[PDB]
Ligand binder design. Structure first.
Ligand code: R2F
Ligand code: R2F
Ligand code: R2F
Length: 256
């Protein structure tokens, strides 16, 4: 089946969903007025994405992978351009300049490349895995990162909280992760052999979430309005991606 990556921003919000299909990555966009096909169009068998706002202007980084080569595509308001980033599965997160962290699963090994505003360098993360997802949150200036590494049917959470990578309490399969607030609350979606289920953290242990829908692949994005969380899960079977919406139960979204 296809596989997707999703990012969102702003008050509307705007959403961008990238789809790797038959060697080509395309983009579908929401700006509150219906879904439309965006301008991003590049080769790749795997895609991950991150984005940040500068004022009212979105900046987007899309990581497109073919074989072992990952190309970074940059939206900074004037067309898509090839970024400096130097088969594989990737997952990406960013915070703040910005700083960016890209995790790559390659032949059972997950490694990490980092952007700090100066150049790309190889981060400390090395753990086994065939599938990878990631989420992060700031507590002040302090980044906290959670990487979900999957091998077979086991998914291992790895935690960055300022002083090394520690194995998390979380309990190949393909995952997608999002988080919100300062506790934080986390939600991890896992596509396992045709079905997507949910595991949740609210600061006091992991438990089964209410989301349960079919799909071979999953991506996710979320935003806060005040303290209310809104979540969009993109579940794909074949070339069909269904959007599932949490806005306070889960309802089928308008995405096509
Ligand atoms: C870009 C337009 N302007 C004019 C208003 C601008 C805006 C912000 C900065 C600006 C300039 O400069 C600096 C400089 C520093 N320094 C001094 C050298 C370090 C202490 C610090 C903060 C700001 C910052 C800055 C300060 C606070 C918060 C964010 C930034 C920033 O956007 O940051 C943008 C900085 O970009 C300059 C360096 N740069 C940017 C890139 C772009 O790279 C692309 O984008 C990257 C994010 C990656 O994806 C990369 O692979 C890809 O190729 N390559 N080199
Ligand atoms: C009774 C249990 N203990 C001690 C035995 C405890 C309790 C509370 C804290 C404790 C410890 O430590 C801290 C530390 C900090 N700092 C200092 C600046 C940050 C480095 C701040 C507050 C407290 C807090 C804290 C104080 C007030 C309000 C909230 C917290 C808190 O939950 O905060 C979280 C601390 O642990 C308590 C509950 N908790 C946190 C985790 C973190 O777990 C990881 O991170 C999670 C988000 C998930 O990824 C999870 O799977 C992964 O294992 N597991 N249980
Ligand atoms: C003025 C009174 N009317 C029309 C007579 C009205 C207004 C709002 C809703 C209304 C009705 O009905 C629903 C019904 C549901 N349910 C039941 C749980 C399932 C369908 C949920 C929410 C509302 C909403 C609703 C609640 C909160 C936020 C937005 C909306 C909305 O859809 O419209 C507000 C206008 O905002 C711009 C137009 N808009 C927003 C959306 C939300 O779309 C979803 O969310 C987007 C972010 C995307 O992910 C998209 O694919 C997905 O379908 N659709 N159209």
């Amino acid at each position: 089946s296809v596989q997707t990556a999703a990012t969102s921003w702003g008050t509307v919000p705007s959403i961008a969903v990238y789809t790797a299909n038959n060697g080509k990555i395309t983009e579908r966009c929401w700006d509150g007025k219906g879904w439309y096909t965006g301008a991003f169009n590049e080769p790749g068998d795997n895609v991950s994405v991150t984005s940040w706002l500068v004022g009212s202007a979105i900046h987007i980084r899309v990581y497109a992978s073919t074989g072992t080569t990952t190309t970074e595509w940059c939206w900074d308001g004037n067309g898509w351009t090839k970024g400096a980033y130097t088969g594989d599965q990737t997952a990406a997160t960013s915070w703040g300049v910005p700083s960016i962290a890209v995790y790559t699963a390659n032949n059972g090994k997950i490694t990490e490349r980092c952007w700090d505003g100066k150049g790309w360098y190889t981060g400390a993360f090395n753990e086994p895995g065939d599938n990878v997802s990631v989420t992060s949150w700031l507590v002040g200036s302090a980044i906290h990162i959670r990487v979900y590494a999957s091998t077979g049917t086991t998914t291992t959470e790895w935690c960055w909280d300022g002083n090394g990578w520690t194995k998390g309490a979380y309990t190949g399969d393909q995952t997608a992760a999002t988080s919100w607030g300062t506790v934080p609350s986390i939600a991890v979606y896992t596509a396992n052999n045709g079905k997507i289920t949910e595991r949740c953290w609210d600061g006091k242990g992991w438990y089964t979430g209410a989301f349960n829908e079919p799909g071979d692949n999953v991506s996710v994005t979320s935003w806060l309005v005040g303290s209310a969380i809104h979540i969009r899960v993109y579940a794909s079977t074949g070339t069909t991606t269904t959007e599932w919406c949490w806005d306070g139960g889960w309802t089928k979204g308008a995405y096509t």
